């Protein structure tokens, strides 16, 4: 029978959508389908920043360390296994942004 309405993807008008490589397996996945979560990563762990702030050098505009920018793109296959998105129950499958 049928499991989803969007079958995991958002292709709603067009017949074909660009394919993209998986951040983790390298596998090819259609853009719309594949998981995404472009995150604002930080250069150093918590208590570890303070250590670099005191031994820091250049001016101090209070702008600290540049934060890392990671544009994340997972294919289902590994996205799951990678703790990202856990198999959700029946009616919770339609919930968006919990």
């Amino acid at each position: 029978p049928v499991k989803r309405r969007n079958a995991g993807r958002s292709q709603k008008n067009r017949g074909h959508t660009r394919t993209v490589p998986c951040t983790n397996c390298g596998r090819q996945v259609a853009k719309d389908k594949a998981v995404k979560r472009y995150t604002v990563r930080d250069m150093v762990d918590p208590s570890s920043k303070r250590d670099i702030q005191q031994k820091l050098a250049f001016e101090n505009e209070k702008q600290g360390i540049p934060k890392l920018y990671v544009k994340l793109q997972y294919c289902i296959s590994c996205a799951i296994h990678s703790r990202v998105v856990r198999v959700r129950c029946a009616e919770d499958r339609r919930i968006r942004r919990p």
């Binding site: 490589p21 390298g26 762990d45 670099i52 820091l56 990671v70």
Partner: protein, 75 residues
């Protein structure tokens, strides 16, 4: 490798360092490795002054058929 450089640096008479951080951007995990936050940390602790900090992992505009193919590392 970090502390080894700082020693060599006090001898070059240099105290401040600009950082250009990367990670085989090309068509590879544009994410910094592990020995990243580790290296910096070591330079700061062992004295060293730190100039500006950049991220220079070469992000491409297009791309070229990555590692593996179609399905990639499987297992």
């Amino acid at each position: 490798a970090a502390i080894d450089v700082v020693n060599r640096c006090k001898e070059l008479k240099i105290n401040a360092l600009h950082i250009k951080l990367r990670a085989k951007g090309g068509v590879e995990t544009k994410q910094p490795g592990p020995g990243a936050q580790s290296a910096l940390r070591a330079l700061a602790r062992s004295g060293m002054k730190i100039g500006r900090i950049e991220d220079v992992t070469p992000i491409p505009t297009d791309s070229t058929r990555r590692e593996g193919g179609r399905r990639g590392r499987r297992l």
